[PDB]
Design a binder for this molecule. Structure first.
Ligand code: SF4
Ligand code: SF4
Ligand code: SF4
Ligand code: SF4
Ligand code: FES
Ligand SMILES: [Zn+2]
Lengths: 114, 107, 84, 208, 117, 688, 123, 103, 95, 47
């Protein structure tokens, strides 16, 4: 099956680039949380960052990995600058999403087939 | 249609209205039915119903149902035949029925 | 004892199918004559691994594979489950 | 057919057929299908490689100019082994003509930097990235045009429903605009307007 | 031909000229209309709930063209500036009362321009 | 070899010698516009819209009835044809009212479709436009005959398929009225279907009336209940309601036809529906309360109660899923007294060996059947569709139908062999009446309706019928791989039910009085608080319970079929799954999730939370139920035969009768029908 | 080019929220609306989704939901493309088999035949 | 009559006009499949829509061309040589509407 | 003078009246519940029964080009009043 | 209007009152039609 890979031939260099990206984020979490005057502790923010990485951890195809890395350096490229107000950077956090019951008889107890 | 002499329905007044063939006339009907191949016997609906109008100047719906019974055919075919043809009058007329050709070289 | 019910699954055409079908043909009628109450039951195609089930004692069950076993092996197997 | 119908010309038809045929003769590598709309607009199909060579050609060669890029776009078609048709639509300045260049890609396969021919391609490509997600190799820049900064999901593609997956609102809790899973006051009533009978007999496909 | 607010009309000896035929709802480019029609006592058909969101409404004129009987017509009067987002949503009832408030108005307009349409 | 090359627009196609023109054009994708022709109805020359030109031929030929010799070249778009179509469309539109705003079919009617996509754009002929007196017929069918194009469809259908023969035409020229001449009510099973066949707005649905409109409604695949045929329906939903239900084309079942009771039961879908869980307070009344509160009460009594002294019985309309759920719940407790409303005799191992347990010759085989007797039942009403295909076979390829056990009215004029099980027993013996035809029959069929089986003679009658299938199939009856013996059912749920191991009959409960009883849609009065001793604590779980809810100690408002996406089984064994139309009203959770929650509160938990896992263990009961709209033939009839011959039960003298008789029992039966005001209206319209 | 031949199933996380896990997708060929006769609605596979609850809005009563995917439909030429787009796009699916009219033989003359039971009354 | 609705006088009193009215509103006229790019002279410069029609009633994919979407992309080079106080005039001079640019 | 609920609400020409339990009724506190005081049906019986000495007649419903489209209604059956499907105003054939 | 008079139909308002925004007289929109599903009720007689 042919393909035109993007920045990396194998998952090796993929893992390399995502390591780079996570370095960048872990650099600039404090500068942003101080920059937009967020109320979050740097530790907490960093934890949400590494969480957002862990959510996608199961991917294999290094095309997909590389594309996701493009997404990451793109959004980080927007947060390193001021182009994104306090709003969205908070919007990663969910404060105003009501807690969703994940336990069955609570779901059944309300949602009627969610 | 918009232009018609009389519509075609049975609204009322003759559900049970008595009609009976005459025994000699049953002989006649038997003679008629003998003129068709068996397995059909429905071809006689038109001549028998003719005969009905013959002994009774006009056929009530009880005559239609009655013929349908004699020949054991679904009555809707009897009503159908009664309406589709000009001879059969579904409404009473007088003893003498006057008919004139108004169309063409008579016209 | 304890057996509440016994289930079997075959398919129309396959080696396991022909084997346990033969088992049902010859053995089944007398097997059921033996025990009226136990509701042994039969179903239709499971493409491979026809196997069988036995349910009893508060839902406890055991699962054995009938794949291409002889009607002999099936015989002593069900007699094992029933015997207990 | 005289009234009420557009009069059609065969002059432009024959001419454009000749020109497309010509392009096919000179560029056997990249050219796949060269067709002429019966309303006379030449449209060329191109393998997703020679976009740079083909357009470098169509900007030059002095028997064709196409100095101006009209518009760059794409159409999201499922059912195809390659979802998208990248459609280059060009304007010939010298000859009074327009021809189209169609190329294709799936989601992962990029199309490479049409910028180096036409500067006008600069934003069209970005807009395509944001609204579709076709990646463009070594574009000078890639950012979001027409959508929110934190927004995600490449809306125009049919996988993305009419409304979004989020909404905005404000509440005195956090003193900021927030997001919640989309909730409509009205269902967006759906209509089936497609009637049977194949109003158009010509375009029919063979049944199988 | 000016386009105001959405008055329903009725025949002389008012029949609720609306037949319920759903067209005005079907061509609404903002989709904002609602029609639910239960055959009433007389056996004739009218609408139970005929609604408009003047918020969503773009004031096309399409619902004025599509009505076979000219039940709904864009009013002459622009009379507006409600104090709540509630008040801009119209029941069949509010549209009727809008139609009763002025008709010979609309009768003059339609009687003027029906030669053009 | 019995194939013919005939060109279409110069494109050859190979067709059979005697297929029509319209079919020959269907093969390559041409659909020639048409009216009176219909796939299920014999051909007629009425519509005239089917005209098509063949080159070299001066006159235009009608594509409906014209057979195709060799070498016809059929030019569809040749100018002469298009002029013919424009003409025919014009003459049709000559006399027609302008009802499209008021008319019910406006989003559908083929005069509009074919009018735009074929006929001319502007009419002519000012002075004209005849009108017709409209004629009330049934409560189901609203009738405006002015819109009639007089295309003869309704006639041919009523005659051939419906078999009533009460519709016709009276008149000539402009004036021909299509309908009953005497103003008689026309009502029958399958009669409602006529409103689908009328191509124009002449006939329409009275109860569906003016409510909806085609383009606005969202079609949804679904299945049917209330009939064991596993009928196949598509619910038309509008913004969260059910407007009406359409038969869709399925070849082995329904064809395009649907039963009437099904078609009009949707009104009864929502009338009395139960939206809330309810608990009886010590005052002596049943009131409602918090859902999980009631779940905690029932949970409590079920915790403290065990042994065979706890029971559950289901019936009427229930899925397969919740049957599994309840099964493994009460099995997960102690023991299974679980039952169904019908009595299906189990002596010769009826519960297993599904060969004798269902109808094993699918209806696609009845068209290949030759001689079919019938033991007592009323297929006209029980499983109407099945009767429809019976009349189809009998109509086209000749049949001989024998009825046993009661004179009843069938359309197709059966032979009546008398009434007595002794007659059947004497057919097992070599006694003269009939029974030589069976020896002489090629592929025979014998069908035992479960209703007549509900008598205490059940195992006896089933035994004798099995004897018939023996004396046939053993020697000269078997023509090869083939099946004969089989049974059809009434209530839709029972087949999957007893496939799951339920013990049919209420007998077990009557033997062992429970201290707890569960009810899933059981309105059968065979179980009463009168029977169940002292303090019952009986749970009724269902939707709009009329019967047994007054007896209910606890209410669990289970959802109906249009709501839940469930699994059902037709009497042939085709597994068909319903799909969601509108989520249930009020609270009304899905059944198997109610049982699931009850489990998770109980000290025993079912091994799944989700419908996928549900259907997984459903396969772990029987594998067939995960294979959809696909029937597979069983085997092992003989074994069940020797299992039947083992026990002796004398046959009672009571002459059997189908519990349904004439038309009055067709409607209000099945307990969703008792909701709809519609069914009441047509009932008291027949009683007049 | 260094094409870099690669073999794995294609999946996508670059698309919307957790709906992917819960909802099953449906594949079918919509059966002809019976109240019309014509097939042009058919011939094209479609994809629609498990529906979800709708309620009466207390101000008006229009139906309302959080079901962003409710109103989608995607027309496909062949079923292989349906399963392809379902696999690739990541959410589970269920297929229904296509059905067609069964070929028939209609002979107009059979209306009038001598001994055959088929005969058209009224025609 | 099938492309555009009839006037009411013909609508009423005449059948085919009524039908084509009713359907031409409900369903709307069907357009044969094809891909077109039309361009006109609009006061902001060349304007055009690229229509893509499945044989159907509805369109399928149509991307308008905003002259402002092109002209705006030129500020990078055009404004390179003058300070912002005249970047005002640089933006305003080429006719542009940010309602048209975005779309 | 519309039929009035026990609560005081004015029911409508399609009776919408809220039930004493329904909380939604509170939205009418301090502000009027609007309904057209003139019903439709009440104006149908208002109209006389028109009679025509012909067999089959037309209704434009208020004159040409303004009204509902033409339809010819059949008066043949005289045991009921043939009604227009648009207006609703009856017709008969005189005797 | 006096030189060319209105049609003077019977059902038109004879007031044409003001503008109802604000005040206790104000238009409030609300649902039409009739309930939906007609909930069931238990019998008042015990057992
Ligand atoms: S004018 Fe308003 S109500 Fe009429 S079609 Fe346009 S948006 Fe809809
Ligand atoms: S188009 Fe006119 S008559 Fe038809 S539903 Fe709308 S307002 Fe009523
Ligand atoms: S029958 Fe057809 S053409 Fe006639 S009014 Fe109804 S929708 Fe219109
Ligand atoms: S009533 Fe309908 S089906 Fe019967 S002839 Fe008339 S148009 Fe055809
Ligand atoms: S199909 Fe040939 S006449 Fe109607
Ligand atoms: Zn009128």
């Amino acid at each position: 099956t042919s393909v035109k890979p993007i920045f990396s031939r194998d998952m090796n260099e993929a893992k390399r680039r995502v390591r780079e990206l996570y370095r960048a984020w872990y650099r600039e979490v404090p500068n942003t949380v101080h920059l937009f005057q967020l109320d979050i502790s740097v530790k907490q923010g960093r934890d949400k960052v590494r969480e957002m990485f862990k959510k996608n951890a199961h991917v294999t195809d290094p095309r997909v990995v590389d594309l996701l890395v493009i997404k990451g350096k793109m959004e980080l490229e927007e947060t390193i600058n001021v182009w994104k107000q306090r709003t969205h950077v908070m919007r990663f956090f969910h404060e105003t999403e009501a807690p969703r019951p994940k336990d069955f008889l609570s779901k059944f107890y309300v949602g009627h087939d969610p | 249609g918009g232009a018609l002499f009389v519509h075609r329905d049975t609204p009322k007044n003759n559900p049970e209205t008595p009609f009976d063939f005459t025994p000699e006339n049953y002989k006649r009907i038997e003679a008629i039915v003998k003129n068709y191949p068996e397995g059909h016997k429905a071809a006689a609906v038109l001549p028998v119903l003719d005969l009905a109008q013959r002994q009774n100047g006009w056929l009530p719906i009880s005559a239609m149902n009655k013929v349908a019974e004699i020949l054991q055919v679904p009555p809707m075919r009897v009503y159908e035949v009664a309406t589709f043809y000009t001879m059969y009058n579904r409404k009473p007329v007088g003893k003498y029925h006057i008919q004139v050709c108004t169309t063409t070289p008579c016209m | 004892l304890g057996l509440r019910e016994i289930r079997i699954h075959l398919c129309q055409r396959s080696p396991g199918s022909q084997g346990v079908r033969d088992f049902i043909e010859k053995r089944y009628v007398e097997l059921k004559k033996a025990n009226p109450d136990l509701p042994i039951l039969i179903r239709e195609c499971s493409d491979v691994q026809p196997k069988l089930w036995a349910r009893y004692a508060f839902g406890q069950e055991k699962n054995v594979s009938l794949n291409n076993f002889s009607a002999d092996q099936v015989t002593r197997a069900l007699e094992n489950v029933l015997s207990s | 057919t005289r009234p009420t119908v557009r009069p059609r010309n065969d002059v432009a038809h024959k001419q454009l057929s000749a020109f497309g045929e010509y392009v096919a003769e000179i560029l056997p590598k990249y050219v796949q299908q060269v067709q002429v709309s019966c309303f006379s607009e030449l449209e060329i199909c191109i393998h997703p490689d020679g976009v740079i060579p083909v357009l470098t050609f169509l900007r030059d060669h002095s028997n064709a100019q196409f100095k101006s890029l009209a518009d760059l776009t794409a159409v999201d078609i499922p059912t195809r082994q390659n979802r998208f048709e990248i459609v280059y639509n060009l304007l010939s300045l010298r000859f009074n003509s327009r021809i189209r260049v169609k190329t294709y890609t799936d989601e992962l396969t990029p199309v490479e930097s049409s910028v180096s021919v036409y500067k006008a391609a600069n934003w069209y490509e970005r807009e395509i990235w944001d609204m579709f997600g076709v990646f463009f190799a070594n574009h000078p820049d890639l950012r979001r045009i027409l959508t929110d900064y934190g927004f995600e999901g490449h809306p125009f593609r049919k996988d993305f429903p009419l409304s979004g997956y989020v909404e905005l609102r404000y509440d005195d809790e956090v003193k900021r605009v927030v997001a919640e899973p989309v909730e409509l006051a009205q269902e967006f009533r759906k209509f089936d307007l497609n009637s049977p009978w194949e109003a158009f007999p010509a375009y029919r496909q063979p049944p199988e | 031909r000016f386009r105001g607010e959405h008055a329903l009309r009725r025949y002389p000896s008012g029949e609720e000229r609306c037949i319920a035929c759903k067209l005005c709802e079907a061509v609404c480019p903002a989709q904002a209309i609602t029609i639910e029609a239960e055959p009433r006592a007389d056996g004739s058909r009218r609408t139970t709930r005929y609604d408009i969101d003047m918020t969503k409404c773009i004031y096309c004129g399409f619902c004025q063209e599509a009505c076979p009987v000219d039940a709904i017509v864009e009013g002459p009067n622009f009379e507006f500036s409600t104090e709540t987002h509630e008040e801009l949503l119209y029941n069949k009832e509010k549209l009727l009362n809008n139609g009763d408030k002025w008709e010979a108005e609309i009768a003059a307009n339609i009687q003027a321009d029906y030669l053009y349409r | 070899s019995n194939l013919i090359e005939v060109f279409v627009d110069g494109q050859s196609v190979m067709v059979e010698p005697g297929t029509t023109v319209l079919q020959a054009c269907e093969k390559v994708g041409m659909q020639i516009p048409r009216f009176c022709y219909h796939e299920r109805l014999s051909v007629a020359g009425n519509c005239r819209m089917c005209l098509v030109e063949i080159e070299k031929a001066p006159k235009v030929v009608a594509a409906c009835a014209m057979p195709v010799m060799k070498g016809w070249n059929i030019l569809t778009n040749s100018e002469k044809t298009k002029k013919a179509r424009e003409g025919v469309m014009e003459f049709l539109l000559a006399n027609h009212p302008l009802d499209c705003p008021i008319c019910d079919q406006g989003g559908e009617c083929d005069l509009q479709d074919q009018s735009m996509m074929f006929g001319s754009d502007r009419s002519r002929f000012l002075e004209g436009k005849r009108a017709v007196e409209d004629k009330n017929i049934g409560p189901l069918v609203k009738t405006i005959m002015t819109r009639c194009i007089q295309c003869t469809r309704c006639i041919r259908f009523a005659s051939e398929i419906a078999g009533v023969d009460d519709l016709g035409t009276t008149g000539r020229g402009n004036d021909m009225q299509v309908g009953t001449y005497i103003e008689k009510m026309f009502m029958s099973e399958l009669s409602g279907n006529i409103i689908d066949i009328c191509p124009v707005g002449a006939l329409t649905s009275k109860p569906y009336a003016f409510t909806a409109r085609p383009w606005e409604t969202r079609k949804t695949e679904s299945i049917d209940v209330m009939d064991a045929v596993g009928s196949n329906i598509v619910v038309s939903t509008r913004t969260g309601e059910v407007m009406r239900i359409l038969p869709r084309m399925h070849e082995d079942i329904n064809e395009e036809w649907i039963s009437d009771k099904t078609r009009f039961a949707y009104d009864g879908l929502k009338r009395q529906r139960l939206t809330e869980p309810m608990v009886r307070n010590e005052k002596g009344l049943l009131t409602h309360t918090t859902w999980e509160d009631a779940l905690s009460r029932v949970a409590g009594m079920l915790q403290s109660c065990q042994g065979n002294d706890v029971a559950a019985i289901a019936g009427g309309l229930v899925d397969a899923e919740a049957l599994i759920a309840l099964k493994d719940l009460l099995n997960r407790v102690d023991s299974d007294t679980l039952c169904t409303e019908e009595v299906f005799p189990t002596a010769g191992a009826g519960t297993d060996l599904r060969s004798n347990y269902l109808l094993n010759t699918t209806i696609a085989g009845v068209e290949e059947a030759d001689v079919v007797l019938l033991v007592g039942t009323n297929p006209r009403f029980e499983a109407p569709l099945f009767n429809a295909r019976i009349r189809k076979s009998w109509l086209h390829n000749d049949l001989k139908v024998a009825l046993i056990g009661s004179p009843v009215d069938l359309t197709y004029r059966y032979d009546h062999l008398g009434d007595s099980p002794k007659i059947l027993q004497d057919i097992a013996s070599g006694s003269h009446p009939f029974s030589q035809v069976l020896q002489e029959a090629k592929k025979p069929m014998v069908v035992l309706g479960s209703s007549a089986l509900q008598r205490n003679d059940g195992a006896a009658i089933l035994a004798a019928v099995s004897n018939i299938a023996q004396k046939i199939r053993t020697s000269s009856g078997v023509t090869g791989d083939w099946k004969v013996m089989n049974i059809l059912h009434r209530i839709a749920s029972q087949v999957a039910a007893l496939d799951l191991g339920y013990k049919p009959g209420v007998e077990a409960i009557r033997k062992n009085p429970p201290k707890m009883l569960f009810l899933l849609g059981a309105d059968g009065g065979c179980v009463t608080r009168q029977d169940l001793p002292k303090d019952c604590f009986i749970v009724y779980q269902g939707h709009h319970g009329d019967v047994g809810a007054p007896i209910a100690d606890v209410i669990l408002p289970g959802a109906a079929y249009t709501e839940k996406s469930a699994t059902y089984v037709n009497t042939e064994g085709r597994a068909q799954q319903t799909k969601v139309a509108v989520m249930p009203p009020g609270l009304a959770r899905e059944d198997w999730k109610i049982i699931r929650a009850l489990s998770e509160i109980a000290g025993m938990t079912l091994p799944y939370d989700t419908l996928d896992q549900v259907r997984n263990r459903l396969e772990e009961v029987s594998p067939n139920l995960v294979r959809y709209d696909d029937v597979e033939g069983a085997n092992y009839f003989q074994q069940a035969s020797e299992l039947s011959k083992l026990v002796n039960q004398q046959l009672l003298a009571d002459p059997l009768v189908p519990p349904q008789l004439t038309i009055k029992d067709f409607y209000m039966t099945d307990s969703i029908s008792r909701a709809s005001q519609t069914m009441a209206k047509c009932v008291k319209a027949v009683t007049e | 080019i260094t094409v870099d031949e690669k073999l794995d199933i294609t999946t996508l996380t670059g698309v919307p929220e957790e709906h992917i896990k819960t909802r099953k997708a449906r594949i079918f060929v919509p059966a002809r609306n019976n109240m019309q006769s014509g097939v042009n609605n058919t011939k094209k596979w479609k994809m629609e989704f498990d529906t979800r609850e709708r309620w009466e809005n207390p101000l008006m009563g229009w139906a309302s939901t959080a079901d962003p995917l409710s109103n989608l439909v995607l027309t496909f030429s062949t079923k292989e493309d349906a399963i392809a787009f379902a696999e690739k796009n990541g959410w589970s699916y269920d297929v229904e088999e296509r059905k067609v009219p069964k070929p028939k033989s209609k002979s107009y003359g059979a209306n009038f035949s001598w001994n055959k039971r088929t005969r058209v009354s009224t025609k | 009559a099938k492309v555009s609705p009839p006037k009411r006088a013909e609508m009423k009193t005449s059948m085919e006009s009524l039908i084509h009215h009713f359907k031409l509103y409900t369903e709307g006229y069907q357009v044969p499949p094809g891909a077109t790019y039309t361009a006109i002279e609009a006061p902001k410069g060349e304007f055009g829509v690229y229509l893509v029609s499945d044989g159907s009633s509805r369109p399928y994919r149509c991307k308008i061309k905003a002259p402002g979407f092109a002209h705006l992309a030129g500020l990078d080079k055009m404004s390179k040589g003058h300070m912002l106080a005249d970047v005002v005039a640089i933006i305003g001079t080429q006719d542009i509407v940010f309602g048209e640019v975005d779309r | 003078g519309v039929r009035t609920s026990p609560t005081g609400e004015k029911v409508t020409h399609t009776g919408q009246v809220y039930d004493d339990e329904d909380y939604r009724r509170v939205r009418f506190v301090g502000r009027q519940k609007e309904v057209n005081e003139n019903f439709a049906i009440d104006l149908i019986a208002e109209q006389p029964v028109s009679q025509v000495g012909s067999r089959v007649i037309s209704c434009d419903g208020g004159g040409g080009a303004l009204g509902h489209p033409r339809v010819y209604i059949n008066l043949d059956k005289e045991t009921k009043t043939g009604t227009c499907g648009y207006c609703g105003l009856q017709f008969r054939q005189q005797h | 209007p006096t030189v060319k008079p209105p049609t003077a139909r019977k059902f038109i308002w004879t007031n044409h009152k003001f503008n109802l925004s604000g005040t206790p007289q104000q238009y409030v929109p609300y649902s039409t039609t009739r309930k939906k599903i007609q909930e069931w009720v238990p019998p008042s007689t015990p057992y």
